[PDB]
Amino acid sequence: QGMNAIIIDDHPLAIAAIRNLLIKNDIEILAELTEGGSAVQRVETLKPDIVIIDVDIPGVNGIQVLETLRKRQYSGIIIIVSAKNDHFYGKHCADAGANGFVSKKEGMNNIIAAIEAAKNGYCYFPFSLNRFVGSLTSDQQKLDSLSKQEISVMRYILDGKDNNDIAEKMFISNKTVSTYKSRLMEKLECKSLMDLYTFAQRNKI
Amino acid sequence: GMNAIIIDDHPLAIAAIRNLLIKNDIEILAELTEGGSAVQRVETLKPDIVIIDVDIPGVNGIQVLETLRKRQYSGIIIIVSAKNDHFYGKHCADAGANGFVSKKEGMNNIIAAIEAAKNGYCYFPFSLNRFVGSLTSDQQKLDSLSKQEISVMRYILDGKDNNDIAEKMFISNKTVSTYKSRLMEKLECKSLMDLYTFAQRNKIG
């Protein structure tokens, strides 16, 4: 309807399904980035209405591009997307200033619904009844207590990555992987590896 | 195959919302205009959707929510308001709402909030002031007020003196004076002129 967007995701199939969705609804495509290291600059230059960032872009992760853009006073629409479920990750994109968080696992129709919701000045984030109704409300609060890096170290641990792999992916030292690991294990009140498993399996992460 | 209960004493909105729900094959089980019988009658009929104006008399619309969530109601709850009340939305979201839609901005957001809830997401107003600009501080003070201070505030913007509010909230003039000062302290407003400039600068009405 006369709008445009930039896609920032390095999942080749996801780029296709998003490009097809934006085009099918008359939205122009200024760019398609697969790395964040220039995302902040590209978006500030081309000034697109919509920006779609996968949370797991390499170089600088998806939420980090969102935080920097907002710190640098970018006011346009930003809708974080994920290849995982990552329902707890939605609240963290909230307090960081995003307009949307949609998991590409349930389809592209939530991406377009997140766009029109941001068009109307609203936002389109996952809903966790387990934060207000249930027994896993304490664990959900500890997940909201984590930091931007602690979340990443957690999601990497739940994928089976070692401290060297996490250091290379997050561009930090091995001492910093171990530091994040501890604070993370603390906030979640886990002490052993099995504690983190049953924590993730309880809250389904 | 969905059904809903509408709770609102704005006759122009009851017609506004009943029509929109019928336009999407959503049955209307009950049409309340009262807070005291809300929590009881919702659980008696057990509807999928409950749409509640924040200004309903008796029990505050935010309390119908909190009590329904505390009594472990798992259905869709979508708060609405006659004004804009963007700051009010975050208080609903943290209280367990599936959405907060300002009726000032049309009916199509109600149904969009419903769809967002059906898909497991939520639909709340986006507040750019919280993340970008020079009013990020003031927006946090608004996001820190209590559910009472909120109401005590909004009545002062409306233009109700200390006497009306005490009756409108069914409380003593002394307790009104306590809330007002806590409000005035949290908002860093010393005079009534301060609140006018605060409200106008942050666009509250």
From Swiss-Prot, chain A:
GO terms for biological process: phosphorelay signal transduction system; regulation of DNA-templated transcription. The modification 4-aspartylphosphate is found at D54. Residues 139-204 form the HTH luxR-type domain. InterPro entries: CheY-like_superfamily, RcsB_transcriptional_reg, Sig_transdc_resp-reg_C-effctor, Sig_transdc_resp-reg_receiver, Tscrpt_reg_LuxR_C, WH-like_DNA-bd_sf. Phosphorylated by EvgS. Residues 163-182 bind DNA. Its main location: cytoplasm. This is DNA-binding transcriptional activator EvgA. It comes from Escherichia coli (strain K12). The gene is evgA.
